[PDB]
Structures are given as structure tokens and as C-alpha cells.
Amino acid sequence: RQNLKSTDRAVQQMLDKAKREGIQTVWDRYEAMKPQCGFGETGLCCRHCLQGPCRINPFGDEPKVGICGATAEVIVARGLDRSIAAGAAGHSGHAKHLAHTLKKAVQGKAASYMIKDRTKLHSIAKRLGIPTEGQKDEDIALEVAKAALADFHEKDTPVLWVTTVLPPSRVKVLSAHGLIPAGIDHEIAEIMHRTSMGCDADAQNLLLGGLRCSLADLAGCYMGTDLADILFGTPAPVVTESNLGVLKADAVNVAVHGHNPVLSDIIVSVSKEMENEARAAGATGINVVGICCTGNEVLMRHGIPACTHSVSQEMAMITGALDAMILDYQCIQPSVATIAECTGTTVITTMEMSKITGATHVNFAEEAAVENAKQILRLAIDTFKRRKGKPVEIPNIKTKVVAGFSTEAIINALSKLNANDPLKPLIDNVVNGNIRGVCLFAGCNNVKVPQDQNFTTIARKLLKQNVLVVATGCGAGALMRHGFMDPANVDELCGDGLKAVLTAIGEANGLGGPLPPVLHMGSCVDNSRAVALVAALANRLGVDLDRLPVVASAAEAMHEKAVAIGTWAVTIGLPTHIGVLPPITGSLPVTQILTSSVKDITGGYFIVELDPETAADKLLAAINERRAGLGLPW
Amino acid sequence: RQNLKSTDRAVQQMLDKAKREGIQTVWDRYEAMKPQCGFGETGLCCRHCLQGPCRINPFGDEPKVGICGATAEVIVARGLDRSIAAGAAGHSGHAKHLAHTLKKAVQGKAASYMIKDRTKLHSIAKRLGIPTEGQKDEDIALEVAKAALADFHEKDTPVLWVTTVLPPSRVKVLSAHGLIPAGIDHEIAEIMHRTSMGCDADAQNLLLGGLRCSLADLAGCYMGTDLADILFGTPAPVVTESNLGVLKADAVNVAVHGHNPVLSDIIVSVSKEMENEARAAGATGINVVGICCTGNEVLMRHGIPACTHSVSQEMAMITGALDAMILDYQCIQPSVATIAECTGTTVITTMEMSKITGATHVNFAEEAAVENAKQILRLAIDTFKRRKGKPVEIPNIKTKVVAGFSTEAIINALSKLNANDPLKPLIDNVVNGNIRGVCLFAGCNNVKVPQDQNFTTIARKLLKQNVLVVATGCGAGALMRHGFMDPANVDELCGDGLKAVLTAIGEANGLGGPLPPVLHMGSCVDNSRAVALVAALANRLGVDLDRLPVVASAAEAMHEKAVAIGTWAVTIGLPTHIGVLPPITGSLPVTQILTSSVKDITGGYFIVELDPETAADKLLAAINERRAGLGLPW
Numbered sequence A, B: 001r002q003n004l005k006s007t008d009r010a011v012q013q014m015l016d017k018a019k020r021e022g023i024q025t026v027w028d029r030y031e032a033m034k035p036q037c038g039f040g041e042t043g044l045c046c047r048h049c050l051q052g053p054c055r056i057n058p059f060g061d062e063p064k065v066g067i068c069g070a071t072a073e074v075i076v077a078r079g080l081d082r083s084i085a086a087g088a089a090g091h092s093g094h095a096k097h098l099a100h101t102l103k104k105a106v107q108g109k110a111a112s113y114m115i116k117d118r119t120k121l122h123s124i125a126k127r128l129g130i131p132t133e134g135q136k137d138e139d140i141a142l143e144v145a146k147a148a149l150a151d152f153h154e155k156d157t158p159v160l161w162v163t164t165v166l167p168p169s170r171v172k173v174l175s176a177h178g179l180i181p182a183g184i185d186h187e188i189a190e191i192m193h194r195t196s197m198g199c200d201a202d203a204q205n206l207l208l209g210g211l212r213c214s215l216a217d218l219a220g221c222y223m224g225t226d227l228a229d230i231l232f233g234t235p236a237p238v239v240t241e242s243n244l245g246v247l248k249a250d251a252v253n254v255a256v257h258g259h260n261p262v263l264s265d266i267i268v269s270v271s272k273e274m275e276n277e278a279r280a281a282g283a284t285g286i287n288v289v290g291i292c293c294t295g296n297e298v299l300m301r302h303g304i305p306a307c308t309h310s311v312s313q314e315m316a317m318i319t320g321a322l323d324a325m326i327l328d329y330q331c332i333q334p335s336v337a338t339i340a341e342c343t344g345t346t347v348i349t350t351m352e353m354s355k356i357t358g359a360t361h362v363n364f365a366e367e368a369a370v371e372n373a374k375q376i377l378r379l380a381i382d383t384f385k386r387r388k389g390k391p392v393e394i395p396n397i398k399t400k401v402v403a404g405f406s407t408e409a410i411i412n413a414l415s416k417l418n419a420n421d422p423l424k425p426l427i428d429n430v431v432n433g434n435i436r437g438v439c440l441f442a443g444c445n446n447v448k449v450p451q452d453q454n455f456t457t458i459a460r461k462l463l464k465q466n467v468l469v470v471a472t473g474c475g476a477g478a479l480m481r482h483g484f485m486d487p488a489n490v491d492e493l494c495g496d497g498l499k500a501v502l503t504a505i506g507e508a509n510g511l512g513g514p515l516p517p518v519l520h521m522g523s524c525v526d527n528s529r530a531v532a533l534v535a536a537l538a539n540r541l542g543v544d545l546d547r548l549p550v551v552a553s554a555a556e557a558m559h560e561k562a563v564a565i566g567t568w569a570v571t572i573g574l575p576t577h578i579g580v581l582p583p584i585t586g587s588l589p590v591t592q593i594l595t596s597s598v599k600d601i602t603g604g605y606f607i608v609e610l611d612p613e614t615a616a617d618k619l620l621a622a623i624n625e626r627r628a629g630l631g632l633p634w
């Protein structure tokens, strides 16, 4: 009964193949882990010194307190803070990589890279206060890259990728509570210090530190999107496909998996050059497909089809047709390196700090990107040749996907209804009830939740209640694989008011039809695009973000990055649903801060709800409360 | 049977008082924690994503692998790496605080602070390559503080507080393996990234990252010592006392506890001004005493007596005579805030990122240090008044302590035997066998080990075998409280060869007697002083550190900081004993790297040995192997 594992039919088909072939999957490893430790599940475990491990019984008798005296409050808050810091370390490390790549490009040290989006470069410079008049583009970009790198450490200004991206009124609220980050890596290190043994031991103080570190994560996300748009182009609407049926038995199938477009973007361009080399090997060409966020990056910019996402990533290999899986970092199940010996896939790592035992490592250097890409793709071609005559089982299952909804693209689409006040048509339809509010779906799948079940269940209820739904990361992946990015499904999925708006915008954009039911705003760093849209709406309305009828849902969250994103969503003022249990329930005081008293600090708050129908009701109630606070009908 | 808890008689006496008074201690909380989790003890637990908690059975059947596919190797190495990063975050955060204090002082923004050690300032500038000729001291110091802050982030040079403090041959070895840190907070963040889910998953690669992050920790330690010496004076030999008998019933007893001399040094100076204000309240004066590293800082510089250390810190409060405990950060059991309601002690926090629920917080700002110190001390005076007429139980137990052996002071002492080649008398006596080798004792006590039993057992065996013993942190605390810093105990404790050398040096220093059996080199950051001494010996000999008969022992380690120090001791080339089990035994491959194959990378290696007699034998064997490698008798 594979429907309990994934709601995606293509994944179900590959689970049947993996089972008959004896290939262990993430779901099998989860089953073998049950029952999981109740101390860890509730957050009541600490290993922060060698007197541990310490634990606290959720209920009953001793142990009641850690060996050093750490209470349940402290232990829970310290663990949570470390998870936020780890997420911030990932999103911002990605951004740092892109900042160094941009610097190299404009210094003449990496000619495979360039300023592709001159408009984005100039806007970012203007947002940061960097002068552009009479300056060469390469000098403007050098100053932007320098500013990006400076935000990682203390200096005479706070993190500009926070203070220049949120409205002044929100910055003032955050500053009053000491929550503006001083430097991205500075805050990460301060979290690791304050949570080490014998340091911070006050739950409120620890959690305020966590909120501030979550804003360091936001800055890394926003910096990542800004720099990737400069280097690779700001997305605009594009049509493609998703799910395993995008693999082609007669092509060299190459998955790009991981996170950074510095790698996946070059793979895409070089693969086109090597088409004739692929044909010589008996393929039709090189079919690049996406997994996880780096797949989202090349889908959003180039229309590269998405193969799969998150928890089901091993299933692409089980088809037998995946000739290469090209990795950089984050969210890659290390099982891929062993499964590859059963499936024939060549798994290739490329980043010095992210290797997997048993995978081939091909160092990638931006200074040699094209040559390193050809080396990698030639391994894929050789692998295609090795499977000559082997049957493959690619599920013949795919959906149509309209994506590429950057904030610039959303504003442009709306400008066709109101050229000089593009946000007004959206606001008009929020006021008249055709749009009840906005919900951002973000984050991962998680093996504890039947894959995609929370995303689709919640999305369907919100869409029927006229909520404008936007999505990023593997939430966008879930929704695309279930048809939520195909405009042909607007009639079935959308309430009448929402359908009217999607249709009006689409017809003004010449489509003869509507925008898709859900707007794909990109990768996990591109949650920063949703911030840009929400901040622009707040600024246009003259209100702070905690008065807007906008919510977020990390409906199947997994990674430390998703915890960090959820936390900065709360910190900027949003009601934020999480559909899995974070390790907080072992402390009622911590849970009460994160779900209730934080409202009095930032206006946002977590909504912890594992039942998706109930979560949808709670998200609708949060939206409707905001509408009432603005004096609107609901 | 309190001897199973601590070998310190004063601690035993206070344990009896705490038991009859019903005051729960760290030992009681440990007992309540037993049996501790075997997954955590062995390192085979992972909570790095919300699919967890994951665990791996050390032996037997499933679970055998984490849900994402993470092996035991990966899980163990990732946990270890996070501990190193957390330690680095603490030592280097301390150093960053001091760098900002020095900058403020010389900019005229904090007149309670100043350049006290002009000689140290100029030497550091010369070591770093900063010009001094024709420059004002305040400008030289501004450049030193700027250089310190720059080492936290990437720049055009690597971390100078690594590359300028180790010999070029060692830097070359480390560079060849990619182990030189690029920036202190940069490496901390990169560890948190690479150890997050779906990133680095190769044990060797992860551990190389850990070694590099341990060098970021070394840089933070060395920077902390350098800056504290500039601001507060480089230590020189001083005579004082240790143990609870240094408390005085008729004085206002104030403990400084935590880490940074930016706080404890001002408390010491202001307390002297407030003597008459204390007498008005009926005290004889203010008796400042030390706990943990900040106590070591003021002991080394000012001869402030040490009250207690590490695991036994609560016992100072149990006397009933501790009027205030002034805290900044690190290694403070948060139980102190609750015990204070039973003992009457005023526990005061002072740093924004290190608060304890139930303790009074008095913000300390360097710009207002004197006024903030008087506010704090007036709380202590009021507390002294409240205990008028209450009996106290101060154990009448103390030892004499000769300390203050900075590397400068050791070189000066040796220069009395050879003025222009001060290291030669030490080397001469290593060659002739009067000194078998050198052992650094470092790190914490740990409730799992009867307090001080490993430090004293190992030290006694090494001293009888003519090993020169140096000590820092709570290893120095253990040895001082058991008489190892009293020169009257040289005859009892030291082998004939070592006694001869300690006597020759002491008599050349006008003492009419020997140096003490163990040389106190200061706080935990002052492990960097041992590096300076060992690097100077290596440079004088023309060999790398991994050929010297020098070892280290973290005989009762606890904190993540101690893991980081142990790891950089291995990385710079030392055989390094740890006397508690770090969470590594669940992976034989990881254990084999850390105890064996790392020898081929750095020349150092861990010696994991919980039995102290056996650990002493293993340390002696390591020393003697080094002697043989140099062609010396042993």
C-alpha cells in the first residue's frame, strides 16, 4: 500500500520497482527507525557537553533537569536556536558562493559568468545606496559583491540585506527588540556560543537570539536570489513539465540536484553544445532535468523540466534511465551514492565541502566551469552507452507547469491591468473579496507525512476559498507534480472570485486564458521574492506586514533551512503554519512563546498543526482575522 | 561516600552540607540521569532534520543507517564537527569582545580601559607585520584591533592568528591539506552548513573540515590571550591561594565567574576603591575570589585567590558566605540561579547573550564599566548586610599557589640561566634527561569522573618520571587545589632530574628554592601560551612540533571548547589524551582516523583513555617515542 508513502503516482510506481528489486528507500529506512526516540521528538535531549547525553522526561519523575541545571525551557530553546543557525549557514553559504562568483566574473577571472540582468544589477545597487550614475557596470557589480560579502561580518552598518528589504516601520519594530542582525556569520557564531554549555539559560532571551539569527537567514536568502538573478537572469513566465515522465529513455538523462545555480546554470548551457557528441554515442541529446532547488533554479530561468523533489529523489534513479546525478550541496540523501551501484547512475559531487563516500568527485571551479562541465557530462554520456539495450521503467506521468513568477514578473503581469500602479489591481481584489488573502507554501517533503498530502490538501481548501497561492521549493514541487501549475485546472481548483482574477490577469497578458492556480516563485532562497512582494504591498498600503492578510505554510517541513525560513516568516510578521512537529512540545513555555506571545513582539506566530484539513481552517482563520483588522468583509 | 564525587576535601565538606540542607547538586542531577542514553554516548544519534531523531544501534540489527542514508561514520563526524564549531564560537566570541574593547579604549570611548602592556602591543604588531616605527601607540593598537576583527571573515589573507603563530613548516603541512582557516566565523558557519542534512557525507572530508575549524578555535584563543595581555598586562610570577578557605566570613565575598577579563579585571580594581563603603556596611572589605577561567585571568594577573572550579562551582554558594557571583558567559551551571534562593547569594548576569532565569541582570557596557561595577558591588554589599548574624560554613582548607607563568615569564625565568639563548637550558635538560618531556594539562572537570582524580593521578606519575608539567583552565584549578603549585611540594612530587631543573631555575631567579611542581600558564584561551612556547622550541630546534616530546591531556574534559582545544592540539602535531569518552566510539572508522590515521596528516593524534594510570603510561610512551625519534635516550 504505497499510497501511504507517496500521493504521487509516479513515485508509487517506482516504489513498487524498488521493492521487487530489493533496493532500500527512505521509506524503508524510516520504517526501520520506528519507534523514534520520544526525548528527541519533543526536544528534551541535550548533547551540548561531554557530561551528557542529558534528557528530561516529558512527564513523570526524574530526570527533570539537565546535569548542569539546564531546564526543559533552556534545552528546547538551545536546540531550536542551533537549527536556525544551521539553516542560516546553508542559505547564506549559497549566497556567499554567488557573491564570490560575481566578483570573479567582473574581475575577468571567470568568463563563463557575466552580468546577464543589467536591470536587476542597477536596481539592487539603488536599493543598497550604491551610486550608478557615470559608473561602469563591472564596477557597480564589484561594489554590490563587496557589499554582499560585508554583510557576513560586523561593520558600521547592520545587515543591509535585512534593513534595505523590509519597510522602515518593520525595521523599527525589529530594532526596538534588538533583532536586526549585525552580520550573517557573526550571528551564526553567536548562536553557537550562547547555546553552548553554561551560557544563555533564559528561554525568552535564547529565542530572541533565534529570531535575530533567522533574519540573518533571510538576508542570505535575499542575497542569493539577488545575485543569482544578476548572474543568470530574473525569471519570467515559462512553460515546462514535471515528474518522472520527463526522463527520456533514448536521451542522456542528467539530473541537477542540490542548490546553487553557479553549477546547474552552466550544466544547462554546456549540455546544449554537447548535443552532437551525445548523438555520436547513440543518444538523441542530453536531457537535463531538475531535482530539488537547483532544479527549481533552472526551471524558473530556462524551463528545464523538474524530475522530482525532496523525499522521492531516489525514485529518479530507480527508473534505470538516470545516467548522471550532478550534485553541489544541501538536501541530497546520501543514500544516492549506494543506490547508484544498483541502478548504474553516475553520482558526481562537485563542491569541496560536500562529498559522499562512493560518489565520483569532479572539482568544479568557476574559473574553469565550461571545461569542468564537459568532463562531468562526458561521464554521463559514457553511462548512457553502458545501458545500451537495458530496459528502463520511466513512469509515463507528467504534468504541465507554468512557472517563472518572480516578483518582477508578478508586478509586470499586474501592470497590464494598471500600468502605473501595478499593485492596485491585486489590492482592489483583496478588498472586494475576489482574493481572500495570500498563502505562501514553502519547504520540504518529510517522510513522516505521505508525500505531498499536506500541500495538496491545504492548497485545495484555500484555493476554493479564493486565496491567492504562491509557492517555492519543494512545496512548489509538490504542487507542480499534482497539476496546480497548469492553467487548465483553474476551473476545477479555484473559487469563482480567484478564477475571475487569474482570468482577468491572464487575458490582459494575451493568454486567452488564466494564470495558473498557483504561482511558482522559485527556489527556497526565492522565498525572498515573496518577502519582496509582501513588503511592496505593505509599503503601497502604508501598513506593516503584520496587518496584511498573508500567511505561510511549511506544510511538510524537514530541513534546518525550513526551520530558519519559518522563523523569519514569523519574525517579519506572518502567521506561519508548520505541518510537522518541530522539537518544541517538551517545553510548554517555549511552545507558548512561539505560537502566542511572539505575536506581541513581531506580530507573526507559528501555527503547529499536523492535520492538514485543520491546518487549512487555521490558516483561513488567520487570513480572515487580518481582513477584519483592516475593516474588510470576510 | 562523598569521595566518589570529589577528591577535594573542601568540596566533600560542602557536599555534606548540601545533602543535609536538601540542596540538589550537579552530582545529584547526574545520579538522576542514569542510565544515560547509549546512542548519545556513542555518537549514534542525529537530530539534524525533522525526519529525526535518528539513531543507529552500536551493535545488532536495525536501525543501521539514518533515514536520509547517513551512515554511522557520517553521523559521528557531523556531531563532532558541530561540537568543534561551538567551541570555536565561544573562544573566538570572547576574543571578538576584547577586540572591540581595545578599539573603544584607543578611540576614547571607554576610558576605564587602556594599553597597559606596551611591550606586548608592539610585539604583536611586529608578529602581524603591522608597522610601529613613528606611529602612536593608539594607532598601532587600532591597527591590531582591526586585524583581529578582520580574521573573523574572508579576506585576501588567511587567518593571521594561525599563520603568524605557528612555524612556517607547520603552516606548510597544514596548507597542503587545506586546513588553514579562511576566517573564524566563516569556518564556524561552513561547519554548520556542511553538517546540515544532505551536505557533506564522507567521514574523512568532514573531519578535515573539523581540523580546520579547530584552528579557527586556536586563532580565537591566541587572539584572546594577546588582547587581554595588551589591555590588562602580561602575567608574571605571583603568589596567592586556592580553594574555599579563601572566602572570609567577615568580608563581602564576591566571586567572578565565567570568562572575560573585560569584566573581571574592572571588578577587581573597583572593589579596592569601595573598601571604605564595604566597612561602613560592617565588612572588613570586598574579598574578590575567582571561579573558572575569569578567576584564572585575575589570579594570573593580580593574584586574586581562586575559590573553586568547574564541576564544584555550586559548593562556593553552599558555604553561605558567597554574597555575589558575577557572571559573563561560558561554563556557568544555570543551577546557580536557583541555588541562590537557598543560599542568599546574589547571582548577577552582565552580558546580553548570556542570561539565566531568576538571576539579576545588570547590563555591563565597557563605556560605563566603573559605574556598572559599582552598581554590581553595591548589590553584593547589601547581600553581606542581609547575612549579619547568620553562621557560615567555610571549609578551612586552602593551598598556596605560585602562578603567572606566561610564556614571556617562562622565557625570562630561563634567561637567568642563559641570557641570550633562554630556551637552551630547557632543551639542554631535555637532552640530558633531567626533563623527559612536557605535558600540558587542559580543560574541565566532568561529573562522570571523581573530581580531579584523573588530573592528579596522571600528573603524579608524570612528575615522578621527570616530565615538565604545565597547566591551564580547570586543569590548573585541579592541580592548584591539590598543592601542585606550591614549591614546598617539589621534593615529594618531582623526580630527581625535574627537581634539579626546577631548583636551578628558581635559585637563578633569587627564590632560594624551586619553581613550583606545575607551571600555571593561565586560562583556557591561554592554552595559546603553551602553543607559543612549543612553537618557540620548535623554531629554536629547526624541527616541526610533531617531533617534539610534548603532549597534552584534557583529562576530565566537558565543554565543547575542550573538544575544540583537543582537536587543535592534534592538528598542530601533539599526542593528545582525552580522559572522558567523546561521542565517537559508535564509529570505528572515525575513531581510527582520530586516534591513528591523523598521524599521517598532522603528526598528532588522540589518545582516548579513561583509566588514569593507563593514560599516564600512554602519555609517557608518546613522550618517549618522540625522544627516540630525536635520537635521545629515554
Ligand code: SF4
Pocket: A046, A047, A048, A049, A050, A051, A052, A053, A054, A066, A067, A068, A069, A070, A075, A196, A197, A198
Ligand atoms: S549542557 Fe547541560 S544539559 Fe546539555 S549535555 Fe551538558 S550537562 Fe547535559
Ligand code: SF4
Pocket: B046, B047, B048, B049, B050, B051, B052, B053, B054, B066, B067, B068, B069, B070, B075, B196, B197, B198
Ligand atoms: S539528517 Fe538524516 S540522519 Fe539526521 S535526523 Fe535527518 S534523516 Fe535522520
Ligand code: F3S
Pocket: A292, A293, A309, A310, A311, A330, A331, A442, A443, A444, A445, A473, A474, A475, A524, A558, A559, A561, A562
Ligand atoms: S531543496 Fe531542501 S530545504 Fe526542503 S524545500 Fe526541498 S528538501
Ligand code: F3S
Pocket: B292, B293, B309, B310, B311, B330, B331, B442, B443, B444, B445, B473, B474, B475, B524, B558, B559, B561, B562
Ligand atoms: S572554565 Fe570551562 S571550558 Fe572547561 S576548563 Fe573550566 S569548565
Ligand code: FES
Pocket: A037, A038, A039, A040, A041, A045, A046, A053, A055, B037, B040, B045, B047, B053
Ligand atoms: S535520548 Fe534520544 S534524542 Fe537523545
Ligand code: FES
Pocket: A037, A040, A045, A047, A053, B037, B038, B039, B040, B041, B045, B046, B053, B055
Ligand atoms: S536517542 Fe538518546 S541521544 Fe538521541
Ligand SMILES: [Fe+3]
Pocket: A259, A292, A293, A331, A473, A523, A524
Ligand atoms: Fe532547497
Ligand SMILES: [Fe+3]
Pocket: B259, B292, B293, B331, B473, B523, B524
Ligand atoms: Fe574556561
Ligand code: NI
Pocket: A293, A443, A444, A473, A474, A524, A559, A561, A562
Ligand atoms: Ni528547501
Ligand code: NI
Pocket: B293, B443, B444, B473, B474, B524, B559, B561, B562
Ligand atoms: Ni575551559
